Design an enzyme around this catalytic site. Structure first.
Site: not given
Lengths: 278, 278
Positions: A45-46
């Site tokens: 994830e970002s």
């Protein structure tokens, strides 16, 4: 340009735990561009830190390389820890699609080293595919009931009779791919101290280092099945077999029929810091 | 601490092409630590710039998140472009496991915007699994012979009768997983201008943006099968369908039985720059 940091969530040592990239001052980025950046980075994830819209401190949007998520544990924990470098507040209120999540930040000399979150209260039911799941994992039976919990993502729990039996698992990942929109969390332990491993073709990970949205559910599972009480914290060590040890702490207050709080906490550490050109 | 840059290889626009992380001054890092950093980053490849040991300018080590590679096209192109910020030289000699690879750097006002490499000369033979591969791709036949090339990695080429037929492919990736230690490159075009798509369960990618080690082989394939001459350059546009358009240029000199040079070139652009804490 945007600045970012990479935080290893549920770890105090870089290269342990589970990484998340946190992008600051993201209000100029359209969501399609946030998605492209998350794809570029290719981390699990970002996240993107936006101005709040409902009275919190910030709005956080969470992306895998392929889609936006409504809630995610390790990515939100890392974001809260990262945002420590930019606030003095003891508490941080992070707006998400599932509502505002309250964090308590823990500091030493101005640096946030850990944080605790109140997670969405899950729901659960029996999986009802036990023989199929057990065959995929390569074992005959679970210790405790095989139940699937929902708090955004879905997490199924399968209990092993010892830590060594857990480490011995070598699942058939093709067989596991028949289990859609869920992660499979296998666990073992006793008392305060538990071990877990997470597998999820559906979520694009062969084996996960630290599944933060599964920690709250696991505390509930252990309490309902008489291994701990409601209100008692557990330590869940994940990712040891893959060389990314991750320590998650969880507690579920109330009773099964009326849960009042599900708390998950852990350390986080900065692995890197940078700037992107857009 | 180490500085790094993220280069989008085979692109002049950020978020196009194929990313590689390039880590500078890496001589203090043991290989097991380079591997852990490459895993942390989770990019297709991370490279590490080391002091030369055989008369080149630098030794480059190339890692996926799981293993070291002897040769890789897009990662070496990105490394050469990145190292432009640190040399004035027109040519760069990069040592690898397959020997020293010569690059020509192309600059505008001190910034390297592109580079050309002389690749290892491949070998090739018929795949001999045509019906099985065609079934996996969902088509009846190839245009040109289905042949597999080796220059480190292995690349099989399957020809489509039009660009639209190429874009229409929706392969069965499970079926493709029976093809070990290779990438499947499907192509279409005419004259100077070709399109490609690459699929490889074996190399951990559903569909690749820019397969630099396949460009040299494709030029050879097209020349051997009479679509271009030896010595004539082709433009290969990859990754359009997945939204990561990548432009690769390739030329193979000599004749099939005595190849003298296989050149691949492209643009590169910096997406980001940062520092890590170890």
């Amino acid at each position: 340009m945007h600045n970012y940091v990479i935080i290893d969530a549920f770890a105090s040592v870089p290269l342990e735990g589970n990484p998340v990239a946190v992008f600051f001052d993201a209000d100029d980025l359209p969501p399609a561009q946030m998605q492209r950046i998350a794809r570029e980075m290719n981390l699990s994830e970002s996240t993107f830190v936006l101005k709040p819209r409902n009275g919190g401190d910030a709005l956080i949007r969470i992306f895998t390389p392929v889609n936006e998520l409504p809630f995610a544990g390790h990515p939100l924990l890392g974001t809260a820890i990262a945002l420590g470098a930019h606030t003095d507040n003891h508490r941080l209120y992070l707006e998400t699609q599932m509502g505002t999540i309250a964090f308590e930040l823990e500091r030493q000399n101005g640096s946030v080293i850990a944080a605790s979150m109140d997670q969405p209260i899950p729901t659960w039911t029996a999986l009802g595919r036990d023989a199929e799941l057990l065959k995929a994992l390569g074992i005959s039976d679970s210790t405790f009931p095989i139940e699937i919990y929902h708090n955004g993502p879905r997490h199924v729990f399968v209990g092993l009779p010892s830590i060594d039996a857990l480490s011995a698992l070598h699942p058939d990942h093709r067989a596991l791919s028949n289990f859609h929109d869920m992660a499979i969390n296998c666990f073992a332990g006793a008392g305060r101290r538990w071990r877990s491993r997470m597998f999820s073709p559906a979520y694009g990970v062969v084996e996960d280092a630290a599944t933060g949205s599964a920690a709250g559910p696991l505390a509930i599972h252990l309490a309902r099945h008489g291994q701990i009480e409601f209100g008692q914290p557990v330590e869940i060590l994940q990712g040891v077999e893959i060389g990314r040890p991750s320590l998650m702490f969880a507690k579920a207050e109330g009773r099964a029929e009326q849960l009042t709080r599900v708390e998950v906490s852990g350390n986080g550490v900065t692995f890197g810091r940078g700037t992107i050109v857009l």
